[PDB]
Amino acid sequence: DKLNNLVLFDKATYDKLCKEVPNYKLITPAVVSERLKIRGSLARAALQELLSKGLIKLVSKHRAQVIYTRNT
Amino acid sequence: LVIPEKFQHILRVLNTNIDGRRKIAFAITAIKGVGRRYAHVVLRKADIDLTKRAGELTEDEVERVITIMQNPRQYKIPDWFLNRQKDVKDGKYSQVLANGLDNKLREDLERLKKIRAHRGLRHFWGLRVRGQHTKTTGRRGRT
Amino acid sequence: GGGHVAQIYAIRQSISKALVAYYQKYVDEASKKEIKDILIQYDRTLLVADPRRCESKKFGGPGARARYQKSY
Amino acid sequence: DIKLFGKWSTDDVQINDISLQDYIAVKEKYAKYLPHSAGRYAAKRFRKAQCPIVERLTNSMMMHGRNNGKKLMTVRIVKHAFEIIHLLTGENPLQVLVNAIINSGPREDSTRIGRAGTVRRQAVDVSPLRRVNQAIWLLCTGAREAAFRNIKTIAECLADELINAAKGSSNSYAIKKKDELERVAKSNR
Amino acid sequence: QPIKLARVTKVLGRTGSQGQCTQVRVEFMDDTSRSIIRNVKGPVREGDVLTLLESEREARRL
RNA sequence: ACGAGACUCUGGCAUGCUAACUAGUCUUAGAGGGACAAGUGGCGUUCAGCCACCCGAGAUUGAGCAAUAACAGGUCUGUGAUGCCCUUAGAUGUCCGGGGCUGCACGCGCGCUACACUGACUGGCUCAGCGUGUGCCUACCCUACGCCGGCAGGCGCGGGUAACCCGUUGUGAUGGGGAUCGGGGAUUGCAAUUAUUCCCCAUGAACGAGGAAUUCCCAGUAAGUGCGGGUCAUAAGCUUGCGUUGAUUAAGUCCCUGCCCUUUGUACACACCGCCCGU
């Protein structure tokens, strides 16, 4: 009974869902997976891409809960 | 980590008719000869990693593994990864396909039925061919 | 040693005991009392090992206490 | 430099009263930097009660026959997402920490009557420790049923565990079940 | 329904067709100190402290 | 005066001791020490003793042995241990020999088995067994490299009378635990199928706490696991032990079953599965 969520990468729809996560109080992949009802691995890839942008730093790796933070 | 592929709601591999509900690439039970350690060996021999995103995985990998399964004997790869080996009527491992057909050939009971043997009717009634004890344990097989 | 509870916590007993002996021998005893009191007042399990050990399989039963099912 | 853990400290958290330490008691050797103190809690009665509240909450979740008592699970869970939330919060979890469970707690339970009859139960209370810990055990069952056949999993409810842990107000679910049973049994007072 | 802190003086024992309830006796601390009795479930140690959230619950004896 | 305790064995403990060219006093095993309700509180003609708490490795700590009379309980199929009533030559001696009982509409009794980021592989850091092992018999003992498909291994190859060798033995039927059953070289046991012998293809089985009646169990319990002996051809699915993982519940009562240090009733004494009355 999995839900149907728009995962299509488009010109318009793609750049509206990549800028909704930081608009919440408690923002973590587990919280987004229980609340917004999308795989936590998508949030993991999102914060990995945020790391690739060079605005945060990795600390540890885990198949469930990753650790990327900032100190500035 | 962005792919230009589109989400496909119709995808067909081997002309089966099954529901698409869970994830892919290890729910391939509908595909009979790909998976587990053989597929892992082939993929590691193909030099591909897990850098991309999961969930949205296409069928190029399974097609390549099937194609390399088409002609496995040339490279002297250990040929203990195929279902029916050293079978009657062919000393070479011939290919077949389609659903509703592997299950029948998993039990080649025609010749043993012909020879008027007890093992044919051991297989036929769905009962125990090697002799699993069934009088206090082993009541499953029909439930 | 195999076993985290075994070799770990053995490392802490070892550091505490070696430090205590070294301080007792090389400098004095009052400083030893202060530092050892601090360390073994952090926790007690340093100097005490668990006495629990697997007990003998007993009579007419699969284990040390369980018994084969009795039929009437 | 007698600060508890690496981020709290005992020199300022005071209640100016020496009788309300039935839930948080950090003044002696019993304080733990990590609850993995090993040991047994069934050798003799009142020794399960003499467990620290933190260790009882983290261990008592051991149930089924496959995760039974494997302390590595409890310690890994209490380390994971704890290391994360401490830096990602910045503020104090103290509010919810305290104000859901540690006075969600009920105030009575029920016991058997006479020599026969299983249609009602006479209302008694306990000194709040046993009642609170029975509520905690049912809350462990509730966290299971919120993970067991559900969405929110184990080792990601550290907010809920801190809620179950700290001190003094009412927001729970299994505890309001306990309070419904409270009222049912108290209908005999 | 006042929360009153009382001290345990004597613990009686268990009651039930198989044993399911425990009797104790408690003396108040600041309510014109006197002694009453009450039943209770679960571990209640030697000379521990009870919280009488209500000052009327009496347990029938025998 | 027996029985109970004491007593023997058994685990638990040394900034101690008697010493080893297989460990470096950790392993092995000592003429020995250590706990005793001992110290302190609280209950106890303030007695015997009970609870609690520091301290302590350990604070009702596994088992063994275990009172007359007993029972027509089992054993004469363990025994030139045993008194003779008494059949048959198809001696209940022998000889890789020969049907079964490995049936499945079950008549019953022990047995084989865990629900998901816990269950299972990446093989990416030094693990434990308690114990067994080869000529009075006797011909059968435990085991390390090569032919190499992917390892026990079809043949050589050495060590071990053993601390010396084996051996430091994403929200639930999907990927997750197997319903019959087939190939690879098979350990060499005449026969195994009328019981000895490996894992890989993922072919899909009520795939997430169970008629009446229910047996066992209170801490290294139970349960999950494997491993070694007895049986023996490394024959176990049995049993007897051993470790590894490991603890939710109760530190109670006499309600069910049963027991015991009392009084009481009896027409029972073959003793309540008794006795006994009525056409």
Q: Is A52 on the interface with D (CB under 8 A)?
A: no
Q: Is A41 on the interface with D (CB under 8 A)?
A: no
Q: Is D72 on the interface with C (CB under 8 A)?
A: yes
Q: For chain D, list the domains and their CATH numbers.
A: 4-187 (1.10.455.10)
- Give A57 to chain B, closest Cα distance, Å: 18
| Residue A33's CATH number | 1.10.10.10
Give the DSSP per-residue string, D38-102.
Answer: ---S-SSTTTTTTS-HHHHHHHHT--SSSSSS-HHHHHHHHHTTHHHHHHHH-S-THHHHHHTTT
Q: Give the C-alpha separation, C5 to D185, whole Å.
A: 45
Domain with A21, as residue range(s), is 3-72
Of D123, D132, D1, D126, which Cα lies nearest the Cα of D56? Answer: D132
Phi, psi of E4 (to 5 degrees): -115, 130
B109 touches strand F (CB under 7 A): no
C71 touches strand F (CB under 7 A): yes
Q: Is D87 on the interface with A (CB under 8 A)?
A: yes
Tally of domains in chain A:
1
For the segment 27-46 of chain D, residues whose CB is within 7 A of strand F: 40-46
Give, rounded to a whole angstrom, the gap between the first and last alpha carbons of chain B. Answer: 48
Q: How many helices (H) and strands (E) does chain D have?
A: 7, 2
Resolution in angstroms comes to 2.9
Fold observed for domain B1-78: Helicase, Ruva Protein; domain 3 (1.10.8)
B66 touches strand F (CB under 7 A): no
The dihedral sign for the CA sequence B116, B117, B121, B126: negative
Q: Where are the alpha helices (DSSP H) in chain C?
A: 4-7, 10-26, 30-42
Experimental method: cryo-EM
3 state SS for E10-59? EEEEEECCCCCEEEEEEEECCCCCCEEEEEECCCCCCCCEEEECCCCCCC
Q: How far is the CA of D144 from the C1' of F33 (A)?
A: 53
Residues of A in contact with D152 (CB under 8 A): 30, 34
Q: How far is the CA of E14 from the C1' of F156 (A)?
A: 79
Domain boundaries, chain B: 1-78, 79-143
Measured between CA atoms, the residue of chain E closest to residue D22 is: E49
Q: Give the C-alpha separation, B42 to B24, whole Å.
A: 18
**SS3 state of residue A59:** strand
Residue A27 vs residues A42, B69, D85, D153: alpha-carbon distances, Å: 13, 46, 11, 17
